[PDB]
A and B are shown apart, each in its own frame.
Chain A
Amino acid sequence: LLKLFTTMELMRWSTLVEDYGMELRKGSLESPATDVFGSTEEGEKRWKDLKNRVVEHNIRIMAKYYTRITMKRMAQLLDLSVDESEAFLSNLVVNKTIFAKVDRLAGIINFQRPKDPNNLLNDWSQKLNSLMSLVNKTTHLIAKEEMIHNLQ
């Protein structure tokens, strides 16, 4: 639950394979795991759509960061084929991936670098940066100027 809470670090599910296996083996708690796998197809849909759900959720988490994870290398670190990653993109087109940038020559994707209208985006960033430097520069300047008065 803590790994699924937030800031999901890219980890291998093989460590979770034995966790789920012993989750089916031990009967002290969470016993009805065989009842979760009761149906021949329902448990398979919950498992495939479960690993799919976390392999999409971690993409939704790393999509906030603009670090350019270079999903071409990520497909190599995840040890999976690029075809089911294109199917994952087929899940992203319904997952509202409209804010993205792809490349015809290479395979690197970009979740940022829009047309960047200078009257809205650079306007906003320059407003928060310049104004934040102005008022933040204003607070501790005279605040420290009042802190040095106690030395007399």
Chain B
Amino acid sequence: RPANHRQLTFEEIAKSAKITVNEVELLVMKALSVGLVKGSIDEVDKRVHMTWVQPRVLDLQQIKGMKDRLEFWCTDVKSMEMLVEHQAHDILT
């Protein structure tokens, strides 16, 4: 999930790793000890917030989604350029 409430909880980690709730702190502590993730969570109730990570193998749905979000960003920057520059060039030049 690249966007749409990146914030998560330990229930998916413990459910996918069939581990108890007492070992998830050592699990994320080892995850931060390896150095592949820099995630620091300011949570009060148990939550899992993550940061920069590298796939390093492949992702085709992220290639197509990369084209979708990339084209969306490009047409939004183009829309703002034509919008601001449209009347801005006519009134200021």
What residues make up the interface of A, taking CB atoms closer than 8 Å to B?
Answer: 7, 9-10, 62, 65-69, 73, 77, 108, 110, 112-113
Smallest CB separation, B20 vs chain A (Å): 12
A112–B33 touching, CB < 8 Å: no
Which of B1-9, B22-30, B56-64, B84-92 is found at the contact surface with chain A? B22-30
A10-B33 in contact given A65-B40, A66-B41, A113-B42 (Cβ < 8 Å): no
- Contact status B42-A66, CB under 8 Å: yes
Q: Is the CB of A7 within 8 A of B42?
A: no
Task: Find the A residue at minimum CB distance from B44.
Answer: A108
8 new A-B pairs (CB below 8 Å) besides A10-B25, A108-B44?
A65-B40, A66-B41, A67-B25, A67-B39, A68-B42, A69-B25, A110-B42, A112-B40
B38-52: contact bitstring with A at CB < 8 Å (1 yes, 0 no)? 011111100000000
Nearest CB on B from A46, distance (A): 28
Residue of A with least CB distance to B21: A73
Selected contact of B29 from candidates A9, A66, A110, A112, CB within 8 Å: A9
Query: How far is A62 from B41 in the complex, measured between Cα atoms in Å?
Result: 13
Inter-chain contact B41/A77, CB cutoff 8 Å: no
B3 CB, nearest partner CB in chain A, Å: 16
CA A66 – CA B25 in complex, angstroms? 13
In the docked arrangement, what's the CA distance between A65 and B41, Å?
9
Cβ of A144 to closest chain B Cβ, rounded Å: 14
CB distance from B10 to the nearest CB of A (A): 12
Contact between B42 and A112 (Cβ–Cβ < 8 Å)? Answer: yes
Residue B32 interfacial (CB < 8 Å)? yes
Find out whether the CB atom of B32 lies under 8 angstroms from the CB atom of A67.
yes
Can you give 20 contacting A-B residue pairs, CB < 8 Å?
A9-B29, A10-B25, A10-B26, A62-B29, A65-B29, A65-B40, A66-B42, A67-B29, A67-B32, A67-B40, A68-B41, A68-B42, A68-B43, A68-B44, A69-B25, A73-B25, A110-B42, A112-B40, A112-B42, A113-B42
